[PDB]
Structure 1
């Protein structure tokens, strides 16, 4: 992995820095690294592919060292370097794809492809260059068992789930009370509704709670908290709990009362925010607990007193809500997020080459299922394939 990353980095630097007319002092170190790579890789034979529709490819290395006896690079030097660079880039591409399309139940962190296992030998350690990239840095840190960390913009940590709970209900679905939530990607929208508008509740207050446990611990997360659930504030016809009928939900939105957002780690409240909306910070947590209330307005104008009667024919159903977006976070484990493209790259390679469903990842790399059951083996394999995808992306775009 480190050697493959070094190959990719050396090739990217060769393509970026070896240009016509450049001073040789601008490249001398890179040229030493490139000649070291050629010397190490010469005389070895590699084979990639053979899984799914990924073509079998054989790679042989016999290249001359790039020169070191010019002041400014000319067309000759660039042309001589470019052929070697192209062959090496194709080799790195195929190695990365072959490693990405593979997985293992046991020792998923270990290299799986023949090419990468060969590169893991000791003869290839002479090419390491510099492990600057974030993913390779976290790879090395995890190998040393130091603390890793990936920064995500809008991390995908909540498996898609749209559901509702009915604490009070009847066959006619005329006098419901409960909660109704969507958790998707980096957003939680939760609405607590009551058809009676807390007419008979103690103190004219109905309490609502919603607990979202994360699969991994998130750190130094910036959150956006807003006092309405726009998704759950329009008339809906909703299938019943058992799917045998449909009920009607006609919300009227009130301000949520005594809003309390707790970010908890190991059952201990780490961060607590009361009646504070907008940008908030959760330093370290693994569960989000949203508590709010529907308080029947003590004073009402006629147009509201009409809406909220005492008897059963409730035409408007009181609803409170909360929206919570994780703008940016840090996780020790790898995750999909809005900004990056590693999950898309891996899924794209698998779909393009029709890789059979293996024993670790769900079919089609379904992120919902993966995050829902994010086992240690899946974390290992996913970090491996994401790191390989980053290495590949350094060269392929």
Structure 2
């Protein structure tokens, strides 16, 4: 594995620092490393493919070296080199892809392909170098084991969930009380509604609460919290809980009262914010709890009073809400987010080559399904597969 990495920063820090011009000196420490490789290789036959629509190109090795008898690289030097790199490029591609599909329950955290199982071999370790690519940096630290970690802009921690819970309902659905929400990606929107506008509620206040349990702990999260749930601020016709009929939601929005957001870790409050909208920090949590209330306005102008009668029919439905977005955070486990192409790379290679569904990943690498049942096996396979995708993107995008 670590092997694999080098093979690339080798080529990038190569196809990049080797051009018509420069002084040798820039590459002395480089050229060397390079050659070392060629040697170890030459003579070993490699096989890739043998699944779905994946060609089976075979590769032989018999390549010359790189004279160090020069100062300024003459064009002629480049071309006689690029021609030798373009075999490694078109190679690695066919290598990544091959181990970017196979899955294993028992040892999923390990290598699979007849291509890689041979790389972890000892006689090859003679290469490894310059491990500063965020992902490998983290692969290693995970095998000796310690405080690993990554960076994500608008991460993808919430499996898609869009539903409601009626705490008070009746067949006609003309006087409901409950909450409706949308948890997806890095965002949560939740609204609490009370058709009666807390007319018969103690202190004329109806309490609401929304709890979201993350499948992985997020640390160092920068979060935007805003009052109101725009998504649930418009008229809707919704299916009843049993699917037998449809109800009408005609919201009128009031400010959420006594807003309290708690970021908990193992049941303990790590961060708590009372009615603080804007940017807040949640430093370590596996659960978010949003509590908010609808308080019947004690003073109402005629126009307002008219919306909230003492008796049914209740035609304007009092609604309070919150919107929470995790802009950035760190997670000890790999996740999809709004900037990295890893998930898309893995999913794309599998789709393009018609790779059959395996025993670990959900059909189509479906994110919601994956994060909903993010087992240790899925995570180890995901990390292996994401790390390979990142190695590949250093050369092929």
Q: Give the whole-Å Cα distance in 2 for the aligned partners of 1:57 and 1:312.
A: 75
**Cα deviation code 1:231-271 (max 9, x no counterpart):** 00000010110111100000000000000000000000000
SS where residue 21 of structure 2 aligns?
coil
**Cα deviation code 1:297-344 (max 9, x no counterpart):** 110100000000111111100000000000000000000000110000
Q: Is the 8 A contact 1:45 1:61 kept in 2?
A: yes
SS where residue 108 of structure 1 aligns?
coil
Q: Give the whole-Å Cα distance in 1 for the aligned partners of 2:106 and 2:87.
A: 33
User: Shift in Å at residue 76 of structure 1?
Assistant: 1.4
SS where residue 22 of structure 2 aligns?
coil
Q: Give the whole-Å Cα distance in 2 for the aligned partners of 1:262 and 1:313.
A: 36
SS where residue 396 of structure 1 aligns?
coil
Tell me the equivalent position of 1:381. Answer: 381
**Cα deviation code 1:87-142 (max 9, x no counterpart):** 11111111110111111111111011111111101111111011111110110000
User: Shift in Å at residue 26 of structure 1?
Assistant: 1.1
User: Shift in Å at residue 206 of structure 1?
Assistant: 0.2
**Cα deviation code 1:8-36 (max 9, x no counterpart):** 11011110011011111111111111101
**Cα deviation code 1:34-81 (max 9, x no counterpart):** 101111111111111111101111111111111211111011110111
Q: Structure 1 runs of 4+ off > 6 angstroms?
A: none
User: Shift in Å at residue 388 of structure 1?
Assistant: 0.4
Q: Give the whole-Å Cα distance in 2 for the aligned partners of 1:356 and 1:186.
A: 30
Q: Give the whole-Å Cα distance in 2 for the aligned partners of 1:279 and 1:323.
A: 12
Q: Give the whole-Å Cα distance in 2 for the aligned partners of 1:250 and 1:356.
A: 47
What TM-score do you get using the length of structure 1 for normalisation? 0.99
Tell me the equivalent position of 2:117. Answer: 117
Q: Give the whole-Å Cα distance in 2 for the aligned partners of 1:129 and 1:61.
A: 22
Tell me the equivalent position of 2:139. Answer: 139
SS where residue 151 of structure 2 aligns?
strand
Aligned residues: 397
CA-based RMSD: 0.6
SS where residue 78 of structure 1 aligns?
helix
Unaligned runs of 5+ residues in structure 2 are: none
Unaligned runs of 5+ residues in structure 1 are: none
Q: Give the whole-Å Cα distance in 1 for the aligned partners of 2:12 and 2:115.
A: 20
SS where residue 150 of structure 1 aligns?
coil
Q: Is the 8 A contact 1:18 1:78 kept in 2?
A: yes
**Cα deviation code 1:359-384 (max 9, x no counterpart):** 00000100010000000000000000
Tell me the equivalent position of 2:97. Answer: 97
Q: Give the whole-Å Cα distance in 2 for the aligned partners of 1:243 and 1:60.
A: 63
Quick check: 34-43 or 385-394, which moved more? 34-43
User: Shift in Å at residue 170 of structure 1?
Assistant: 0.2
**Cα deviation code 1:150-190 (max 9, x no counterpart):** 11111000000100000000000000000000000000000
Q: Is the 8 A contact 1:67 1:77 kept in 2?
A: no
What TM-score do you get using the length of structure 2 for normalisation? 0.99
User: Shift in Å at residue 226 of structure 1?
Assistant: 0.2
